[PDB]
Scaffold this active site. Structure first.
Site, PDB file in Angstrom:
ATOM      1  CB  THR I   1      -0.776  -0.008   1.289  1.00  0.00           C
ATOM      2  OG1 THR I   1      -1.664  -1.232   1.315  1.00  0.00           O
ATOM      3  CG2 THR I   1      -1.422   1.169   1.458  1.00  0.00           C
ATOM      4  CB  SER I   2       2.197   3.402  -2.181  1.00  0.00           C
ATOM      5  OG  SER I   2       2.973   2.580  -2.389  1.00  0.00           O
ATOM      6  N   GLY I 128       2.136   3.353   4.407  1.00  0.00           N
ATOM      7  CA  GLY I 128       1.956   1.878   3.720  1.00  0.00           C
ATOM      8  C   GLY I 128       3.424   1.396   3.335  1.00  0.00           C
ATOM      9  CB  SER I 129       4.667  -1.847   2.352  1.00  0.00           C
ATOM     10  OG  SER I 129       3.431  -2.254   0.995  1.00  0.00           O
TER      11      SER I 129
END
Ligand SMILES: CC(C)[C@H](NC(=O)[C@@H](NC(=O)[C@H](O)[C@@H](C(=O)O)C(C)C)C(C)C)C(=O)O
Ligand SMILES: CC(C)[C@H](NC(=O)[C@@H](NC(=O)[C@H](O)[C@@H](C(=O)O)C(C)C)C(C)C)C(=O)O
Ligand SMILES: CC(C)[C@H](NC(=O)[C@@H](NC(=O)[C@H](O)[C@@H](C(=O)O)C(C)C)C(C)C)C(=O)O
Ligand SMILES: CC(C)[C@H](NC(=O)[C@@H](NC(=O)[C@H](O)[C@@H](C(=O)O)C(C)C)C(C)C)C(=O)O
Ligand SMILES: [Mg+2]
Ligand SMILES: [Mg+2]
Ligand SMILES: [Mg+2]
Ligand SMILES: [Mg+2]
Lengths: 196, 212, 204, 232, 195, 222, 226, 195, 196
Positions: I1-2, I128-129
């Site tokens: 997730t960005s 997010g990751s």
């Protein structure tokens, strides 16, 4: 640890931070992570200090003995010797190494050897814990055939960000320039790079 | 698995069941848990089928080499000790064996050695090994005498396996009987437990708990 | 350790022409030790029949529970419960113990008294309903039963033919299971007569 | 025993009337990081064989070197090295399968799934799989990893059995492979848009296509999707 | 606790129960009576975890004695066994279950019949001609299967029981210090003081 | 951790006739819930009128078959082209398997052929080399589904003669090759319905004095 | 389990396979994986079969009561909110993975819901062990503005992909079509591509083959008069 | 194996060793002699892991019998005990150690003295007036501490040993099936056939 | 997730990718991770979909009931309600939420709520990751008081890099613009942002 090697017109530049940590304690704040395996073949060390030092020492021995018999080795040959050690001892090693060198025939070359022992020839390479934070920046700002001053700025700006965000990175930014002209060492202090 | 062997006036009786199970499911009802080492020596199978079968066949080769070299029948003591010393070399590796090495020689008379995969070697008169051993022992201990006839001894061994086959879930299928004499073992047939149970129930008046 | 295979035992149920059949072995064990050869696994509440395999304490408990519930049902409804309705009751009852289930494999069998339609059903331990046309299997030799039933079964068998099929399905399955056997019972169920037969089988 | 580090995802392949097709994307993943974007995972051996490799890249590079050495060795004292005594797909596979099973048997596997695609001397199609366990199998369609779950179902609609192979042209087969690569790009989180494709045909020989891209992608429907349930 | 046996003969139920109480290293007692009289014609022997055994047995005893007073009537052995089973079946899904296995030997005065019920800690009930808990059955059941008849006298039952105890004393590794034997019949419960 | 073993599914079946033997096996090869191949031969002609299948983990199954085949070749070299008898083959396979007692070939092995009197023979092996001559043996995934059926229909277990009511068993009459093949086919059709790892195809290898013959049949592909 | 949902012009179509498994054994060859929440809201269920039935009937029951209370036809968003809040409360222990579809006064809807309580919106969805095979087919052939006939075709083709290629899925294809301004049509066993071939032999036994110990009549009737 | 006792009196050493051989569930033998004669005036009793016990004992026996032939001379008990200790001390740091505890009872013909040596599987040697291995000492040592005198006769030693065996038979949970008793003196080794 | 939220002159813009994964399988490639809690207060969801959906739904309920009684809530109030749920249920939640909103008095505001349940008011926020890869880039390229077009470009370029490197991120870039003018949804497809 934040380290990178970048090829430009006149050759290649290796860049690194100077922080060694045991947990959150900074054991050494003036570490030299850029190491010489031959006159114009150097490397960037990430992972275990003990492993990467031990590896580099063996490589330097192999290339010294190569030189006595067959003359100056290629940067590819150096990367292959690094690879052989890293790949064949993958179970017992924690070593991410960027090999950078200057031939006259081939010019500036960069090889990255991640944890597995694979080899990847690249225009530039980034590695170490701090590299994660600058994948975006480096990819957006790298150009091929930069000048020496542009490449020094690119490395300085990149590692400045890597240091800013990564607690495992810090201290001075060391650089080593590899060209036909010879070998130039550069250092950049916190007061310089933090204000960028 | 229920295996027994006992010593008596007329030699040795050996009796075994026939069942092999994988988890809850019965893989085989027709397993040979008596290894015929040679014409004079018998071995029982309990624990690992492969370990008993393989190493007791190997034992027969060692016994044959002994009698070629020494021009004389190997003693039951010597044969059992070849096996026990072998498995003892493998101790820790995970062999699974519980066996009775049975033979009748002039020097010794009828002899049974319980040999076992953690190195145990025991001489004795009555041995029972397997998941149904306790059931077989009950029948044996209450009916055993040295002066049994060959006919009664054969029946006793048959009946003791039947006792175990009934109660122990992992024993059954059929009973194999052997009688070991000084001139060699004699096979006394395969007896289906299903048919044997009803036959014994009626003729003996036993198993009144079971409706037939 | 596994509660559904401590005590052992099996149930099978089949449909035929204007009839159903339900059958079970009689073994109760404590793992390898045989304990009882008279442990019946089929019960009935009026004309609805329930087989229950699995952990024997739960088999007994659930029988007592469904007797309780079908008795009250009859008092209030003024009529005997039907197989279709009972099946839903079994499902409800099991699911209310979703996170502490009875370790059982129930099997419903019966004929609807109004429509005359043959009915069978199976459940998992938490009440999912398998309402098969052909047959239902349950217990420690369910794999063996699936194999027997899948080859032996054909549809619309007459009561006395269906008896032979289900008997041979049970018997030969049970003989390939260490934890089943020790006798067997077969119920042949028609709209207004039910015959119960004990089978002769090997006792190992 | 190890763990794979830099990894390559699906290799997909199928037989058609006159040969075989094999394809694989050009990504070397480092866990969830999409680290290396220019990795060639199809490695041709001679003009009749292509070996497609997934899983650990350092082991792939080792296998790559073994195959290179195999070609050198076959040429030694072999006047027919470019003719009757050239390396066959079946020889190359059997070698790799021996190595893979020997390595798993020493508890030190090469962490790969490999598909050897090629055409034999007599024109027969060769397509066979081998992995880190030394398990081998052949089928009209073969795929590793995500390809097994997503590509095979699509490729099996073209060639569902052996008798469908002579009915399948190279254009139909290639179309199916290219569509499968698009499906994998939509749905495999460790895939890339760039891939390589190789065709080994008994008439036209080895055609090796680099720098292909997944195209004709459907995303437009995404605009209409709002929230996760009740939102507007 | 260790060995508990039961045998239902023609006109009585005989319960044999070991006398040893071992706490790890030492045998603390060699005269322990592992039984309770629930009612005049119903006896329950028990074996299982320390503490729980007696606590359960006395709890059951109290409840049956309460019923006996309230109704001025002795419950049938069947009824008592069903009550006990339900308590154990309730217990198995408790926070801390009773780890107790029981044999209930009773004489039904209505039916003029002895009855033996075997119930394990899970609440698994069975009526039997003879029964046991733990390893006791493994040694003895082959003897009981052979010799048992439903028309045996009390004396014949006691002889068959001696043979069972002898086989246990031969082949069991543990010294269970002999057994106390009790007989339940139409005249009630009595202890065989020499065995 | 690295797991050197795997399960490729499949089911095999060896039946010994009076003067013939059949060794059948499905052609499906799987891992987990995926199909690797709908046609991957599992039963092999090993020469000297012996057929073999090593079902379970296919890498060990192939290794074992390969080594046994090689053992047939060297037996001919070492012993003046002597035919390897089925009983001798069986004993040899025991030693191959037990050779890896402490890192086993994860397979259930069956071989079939004719004994030295010309009668049908099947031998069944566990993973570590215990073996026995048998009339009837299913191996692999759906073995529990097939064996009870074969007990009932080959050996006539629990079947008694009508009118006697349990007093006279149904007599054990000899089955022809055509009759055995029907029971093989129905065993695998039934196994396919109720076992997810069984399907696609059924390949049967029939051994007689005349040699080895093959028959293939479709199975459901779901 | 292979379940799909596909949107089309005037509604939504839902489909499922009919295999239920206990490990490697097929327990039921004609399992019903399509559940009715209300007359025009149906859902496809993957995971624990008891849970998918229980969770749909509970919410379906509460939906019916809500419909009666409000004098309005039920909405998919209501069923969706009720399902997700229930499943979220049980932190995934209720193993219900659902594709929820239907038509209501707002229009036609398609949602997926995970056992932990997360929901997703889409034009085409699949779930279960055959979802990857099904999704491959959906990704290759789905387009905007499908007709009813095209959507039933695409849905059942996606289930077939699962039937053939996934060992968790098999037997038949069930379909339910929910079109706007129309009764929902529930097509049970829409496709039947797995009929077992005739056996080689009949295994009907001769009468009196089985040995019998005892016979008796069971009294199923009540206590009688007189 | 279970109980092994030793007592050195005035002019002899007495070793008592249990007869039971138990393999988990059943007692397989009730007449097992857990001893080997190493030389005419030296006896070694043993207890520990199955297989290892006998293998070790016979290995020691063979080596002492080899020494006896080579030199035509019997090694002193002390010498034998030192040889045995070293073998066990070597064994404890092996790949798979011998899990064997031993008592060595010998009569030194040079010094005209009985000697009792206790050596555990680690190679821990002690010379004692009386000794045991495992749990046997826990029950018996309080009796031996009280009654033991260095000038006891062989008959008095045997009576004190009976009291030790009785206490074991009372308080030990395991049935060890009695003991075989052997006496080592100037005339050699002999077995007391009634005990 | 960005995911990211960026404040500029006219207000605030929320940006997100559209990828939902189960392991390496992309379960949903057109996810909407930008969610409405009020007319002009939205949020960016990272972590557990089930947890962040459940949280957002409760917040929307709380702000709806707040509005009925006390009129429009502040962005700070919305962030506080998010925080209360996240902090008090920290043991059972995996939720990283960026809260973004437009008042007329306060203008564009961004609050980030990481795993712990702490609140941090920032000019912009990334999470997010995929955010790890763009810390360097975002820090070097963010300016305060950008225009709408500059901020859309900044978000688009940032998330493009985050997607490029993070396997957990992908699909379309969704955006939501919050200003006095109202609420504008934007979408950008792979063919657009990949070539940047
Ligand atoms: C013996 C040695 C492995 C040990 N530590 C390290 O190598 C530490 N690593 C680092 O300091 C940097 O990550 C390294 C980069 O790359 C840098 C040291 C090259 C590790 C966290 C423990 C030590 O010297 O304490
Ligand atoms: C055999 C194979 C089927 C194996 N099973 C056994 O050895 C089982 N044992 C038996 O069936 C009998 O007890 C054995 C006796 O002795 C008999 C097989 C020799 C064991 C409980 C697991 C296996 O499952 O691997
Ligand atoms: C966890 C779930 C989502 C999925 N499970 C399945 O699809 C399994 N299928 C089933 O359990 C049954 O067919 C169920 C479906 O669903 C059907 C009975 C409802 C498969 C064998 C593995 C999965 O694990 O992904
Ligand atoms: C039920 C739910 C928690 C589950 N997955 C997720 O939450 C997954 N996360 C993602 O896809 C992205 O990381 C999330 C960002 O942030 C995005 C979905 C908001 C996780 C890896 C398991 C599911 O739907 O399977
Ligand atoms: Mg039995
Ligand atoms: Mg049985
Ligand atoms: Mg199948
Ligand atoms: Mg991506």
């Amino acid at each position: 640890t934040s380290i990178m090697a970048v090829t430009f017109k006149d050759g290649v530049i290796l860049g690194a931070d100077s922080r060694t940590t045991t947990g959150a304690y900074i054991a050494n704040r003036v570490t030299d992570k850029l190491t010489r395996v031959h006159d114009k073949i150097w490397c960037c060390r990430s992972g275990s200090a003990a492993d990467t030092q031990a590896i580099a020492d063996i490589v330097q021995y192999h290339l010294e003995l190569y030189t006595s018999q067959y003359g100056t080795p290629s940067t590819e040959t150096a990367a292959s010797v690094f690879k052989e050690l890293c790949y064949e001892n993958k179970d017992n090693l924690t070593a991410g190494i960027i090999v950078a060198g200057y031939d006259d025939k081939n010019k500036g070359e960069v090889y990255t050897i991640p944890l597995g022992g694979s080899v990847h020839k690249l225009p530039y390479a980034i590695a170490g814990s701090g590299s994660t934070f600058i994948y975006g920046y480096c990819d957006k700002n790298f150009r091929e055939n930069m000048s020496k001053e542009e490449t020094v700025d690119f490395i300085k700006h990149s590692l400045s960000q890597a240091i800013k965000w990564d607690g495992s990175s810090g201290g001075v930014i060391r650089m080593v320039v590899l060209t036909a002209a010879g070998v130039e060492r550069l250092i950049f202090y916190p007061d310089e790079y933090e204000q960028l | 698995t229920t295996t027994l062997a006992f010593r008596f006036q007329g030699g040795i009786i050996v009796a075994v069941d026939s069942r092999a199970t994988a988890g809850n499911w019965v893989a085989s009802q027709t397993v040979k848990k008596v290894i015929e080492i040679n014409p004079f020596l018998l071995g029982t199978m309990a624990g690992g089928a492969a370990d008993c079968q393989f190493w007791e066949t190997w034992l027969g080769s060692q016994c044959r080499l002994h009698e070629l070299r020494e021009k004389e029948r190997i003693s039951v003591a010597a044969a059992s000790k070849i096996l026990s010393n072998l498995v003892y070399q493998y101790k820790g590796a995970g062999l699974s064996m519980g066996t009775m090495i049975c033979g009748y020689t002039r020097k010794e008379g009828p002899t049974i050695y319980y040999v076992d995969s953690d190195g145990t070697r025991l001489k004795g008169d009555i041995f029972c090994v397997g998941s149904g051993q306790t059931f077989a022992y009950g029948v044996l201990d209450s009916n055993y005498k040295w002066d049994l006839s060959v006919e009664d001894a054969l029946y006793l061994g048959k009946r003791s396996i039947l006792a175990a086959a009934h109660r122990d879930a992992y024993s059954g299928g059929s009973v194999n009987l052997y009688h070991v004499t000084e001139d060699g073992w004699i096979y006394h047939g395969n007896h289906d437990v299903g048919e044997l149970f009803w036959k014994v129930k009626e003729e003996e008046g036993s198993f009144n708990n079971v409706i037939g | 350790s596994d509660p559904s295979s401590i005590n052992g035992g099996i149930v099978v149920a089949m449909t035929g022409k204007d009839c159903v059949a339900i059958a079970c072995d009689l073994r109760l064990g404590s793992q390898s030790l045989g304990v009882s050869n008279k442990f019946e696994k089929i019960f009935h509440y009026g004309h609805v029949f329930l087989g229950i395999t699995g952990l024997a304490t739960d088999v007994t408990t659930l029988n007592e529970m469904f007797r309780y519930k079908t008795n009250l049902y009859k008092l209030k409804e003024e009529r005997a419960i039907e197989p279709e309705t009972f099946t839903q009751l079994v499902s409800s009852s099991l699911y209310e113990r979703r996170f502490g289930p009875y370790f059982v494999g129930p099997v419903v069998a019966g004929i609807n008294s109004k429509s005359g339609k043959p009915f069978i059903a199976g459940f998992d331990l938490i009440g999912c309903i398998d309402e098969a046309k052909d047959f239902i299997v349950s217990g420690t030799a369910s794999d063996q039963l699936f194999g027997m039933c899948e080859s032996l079964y054909e549809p619309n068998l007459e009561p006395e033919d269906l008896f032979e099929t289900i008997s041979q399905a049970l018997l030969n399955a049970a003989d390939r299971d260490a934890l089943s056997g020790w006798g067997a019972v077969v119920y042949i169920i028609k709209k207004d007569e039910v015959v119960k037969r004990y089978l002769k089988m090997r006792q190992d | 025993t190890q763990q794979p580090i830099v990894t390559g995802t699906s290799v997909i392949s199928m037989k058609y009337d006159n040969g075989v097709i094999i394809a694989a994307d050009n990504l070397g993943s480092y866990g969830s990081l999409l680290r290396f974007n220019g990795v060639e995972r199809l490695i041709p051996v001679g003009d009749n064989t292509v070996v497609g490799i997934s899983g650990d890249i350092s082991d792939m590079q080792h296998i790559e070197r073994l195959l290179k050495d195999l070609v050198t060795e076959n040429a030694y004292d072999n006047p027919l090295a470019d003719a009757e005594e050239a390396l066959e797909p079946s020889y190359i596979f059997e070698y790799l399968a021996t190595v893979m099973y020997q390595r798993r048997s020493k508890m030190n596997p090469l962490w790969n799934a490999i598909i050897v695609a090629g055409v034999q001397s007599n024109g027969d199609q060769f397509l066979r799989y081998v992995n880190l366990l030394g398990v081998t199998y052949s089928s009209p369609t073969l795929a590793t990893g995500f390809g097994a779950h997503m590509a095979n179902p699509l490729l099996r609609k073209v060639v569902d059995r052996e008798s469908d192979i002579p009915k399948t042209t190279v254009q139909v087969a290639e179309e199916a492979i290219v569509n499968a690569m698009r499906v994998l790009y939509y749905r495999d989180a460790r895939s890339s848009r760039n891939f390589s494709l190789a065709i080994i045909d008994k008439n036209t020989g080895l055609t090796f296509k680099k720098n292909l891209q997944v195209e004709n992608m459907k995303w437009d429907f995404a605009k209409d999707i709002k929230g996760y349930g009740t939102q507007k | 606790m260790d060995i508990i046996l039961g045998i239902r003969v023609q006109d009585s139920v005989i319960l044999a129960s070991s006398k040893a109480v071992t706490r790890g290293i030492s045998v603390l007692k060699d005269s322990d009576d592992k039984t309770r009289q629930l009612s005049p014609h119903t006896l329950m022997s028990f074996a299982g975890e320390a503490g729980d055994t007696v606590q359960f047995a006395e709890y059951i005893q109290a409840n049956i004695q309460l019923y006996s007073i309230r109704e001025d009537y002795e419950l049938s052995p069947q009824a008592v066994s069903s009550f006990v089973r339900q308590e154990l079946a309730k217990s198995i899904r408790s926070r801390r279950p009773y780890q107790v296995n029981v044999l209930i030997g009773g004489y039904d005065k209505k039916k003029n019949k002895p009855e033996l019920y075997q119930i394990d800690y899970l609440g698994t009930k069975v009526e039997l001609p003879y029964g046991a808990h733990g390893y006791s059955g493994f040694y003895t059941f082959s003897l009981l299967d052979h010799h048992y008849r439903p028309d045996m006298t009390t004396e014949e039952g006691l002889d068959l029981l001696k043979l069972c105890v002898q086989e246990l004393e031969k082949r069991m590794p543990m010294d269970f210090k002999g057994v106390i034997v009790k007989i339940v019949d139409k005249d009630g419960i009595r202890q065989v003081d020499d065995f | 951790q690295f797991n050197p073993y795997g399960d490729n599914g499949g089911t095999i079946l060896g039946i010994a006739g009076e003067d013939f033997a059949v060794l059948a096996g499905d052609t499906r090869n799987i891992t987990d819930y995926s199909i690797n191949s709908r046609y991957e031969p599992k039963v092999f002609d090993c020469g000297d009128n012996i057929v073999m299948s090593a079902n379970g983990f296919a890498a060990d199954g192939d290794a074992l078959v390969k080594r046994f085949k090689n053992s047939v070749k060297w037996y001919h070299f070492d012993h003046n082209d002597k035919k390897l008898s089925i009983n001798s083959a069986a004993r040899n396979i025991q030693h191959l398997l037990y050779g890896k007692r402490f890192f086993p070939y994860y397979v259930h092995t069956i071989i079939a052929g004719l004994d030295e009197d010309g009668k049908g023979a099947v031998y069944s092996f566990d993973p570590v080399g215990s073996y026995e001559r048998e009339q009837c043996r299913a191996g692999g995934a759906a073995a529990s589904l097939i064996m009870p059926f074969l007990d009932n229909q080959v050996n006539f277990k629990n079947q008694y003669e009508p009118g006697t009511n349990g007093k006279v068993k149904k007599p054990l009459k000899y089955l022809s090759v055509e009759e055995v093949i029907k029971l093989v086919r129905d065993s695998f059709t039934s196994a396919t319905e109720r076992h997810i790892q069984v399907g696609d195809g059924l390949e049967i290898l029939i051994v007689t004095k005349d040699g080895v013959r093959k028959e293939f049949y479709e199975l459901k592909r779901d | 389990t292979t379940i799909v949902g596909v949107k089309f012009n005037n509604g939504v179509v839902i489909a499922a396979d009919t295999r239920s498994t206990q490990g490697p054994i097929v327990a039921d060859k004609n399992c019903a994986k399509l559940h009715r929440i209300s007359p025009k809201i149906w859902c496809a269920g993957a995971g624990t079969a008891a849970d998918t039935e229980a969770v749909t009937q509970l919410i379906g029951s509460n939906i019916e009561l809500h419909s009666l209370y409000t004098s309005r036809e039920p909405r998919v968003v209501s069923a969706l909110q009720m399902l997700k809040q229930h499943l979220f409360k049980y932190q995934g222990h209720i193993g219900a993975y659902l594709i929820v579809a239907g038509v209501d006064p707002t229009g036609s809807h398609l949602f997926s819901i995970h056992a932990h309580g997360s929901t997703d919106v889409g034009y085409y969805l699949s779930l279960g062990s055959g979802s990857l095979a099904a999704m491959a087919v959906l990704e290759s052939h789905w387009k905007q503005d499908l007709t009813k006939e095209e959507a039933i075709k695409l849905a059942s083709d996606a289930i077939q992909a699962g039937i053939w290629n996934d060992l968790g899925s098999g037997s038949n294809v069930d379909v339910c079509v929910m079109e706007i301004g129309k009764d929902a049509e529930y097509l049970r066993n829409y496709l039947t591509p797995n009929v077992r071939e005739e056996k080689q032999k009949s295994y009907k036994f001769p009468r009196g083959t089985t040995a019998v110990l005892k016979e008796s009549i069971v009294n199923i009737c009540d206590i009688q008069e007189e």
